Amino acid sequence: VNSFSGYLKLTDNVYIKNADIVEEAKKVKPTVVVNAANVYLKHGGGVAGALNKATNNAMQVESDDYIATNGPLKVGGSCVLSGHNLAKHCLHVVGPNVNKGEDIQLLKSAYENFNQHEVLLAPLLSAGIFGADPIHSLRVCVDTVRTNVYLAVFDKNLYDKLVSSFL
Ligand SMILES: Cc1oc(C(N)=O)cc1S(=O)(=O)Nc1cnc(Cl)c(C#N)c1
Secondary structure, three states: OOOOOOOEEOOOOEEEEEOOHHHHHHHHOOOEEEEEOOOOOOOOOHHHHHHHHHOOOHHHHHHHHHHHHHOOOOOOOEEEEEOOOOOOEEEEEOOOOHHHOOOOOHHHHHHHHHHHOOEEEEOOOOOHHHOOOHHHHHHHHHHHOOOEEEEEEOOHHHHHHHHHOOO
16 A cells, blocks of 8 residues: 555556646655656756756756766666655656657667666656657556556646547
């Protein structure tokens, strides 16, 4: 039993809710919240901009030190950093950005990072400003992640479409 509430069950291990991931994290304080990161950990907009703003920019400060030490992530890769006031940990995961021409097959590699964590609160990778089809992203999620994932979808219209088209 865990504290996630109001989610629709899609599969054995994947759950989904129309929710603001920032507000969801603030209320649940999950062990892991996933950020929709880029390779530079520049949290300017989308989910990343919202999460960073909620930390009063502490996420960005920590991220800049991480990059200065380690260099950029790989597309499809991840790193674990602090969750600040939102979660114990933040798993920064880089899905491909179609608006940069990155290969969409890297989306499966991105979701594989979730399997290193038993339970996660997460957005749909490569959705929103990353330019992928969220229905495709949900399919890859369900077919790749084996751990327990609670997906927060900000847009109600999109949430209803994801549910209604789910196979
Ligand atoms: C309102 C909205 O539109 C779309 C769309 N496909 O156009 C997605 C969303 S979201 O807010 O519900 N989830 C979301 C938002 N931002 C980002 Cl960067 C990601 C990722 N990775 C995921």
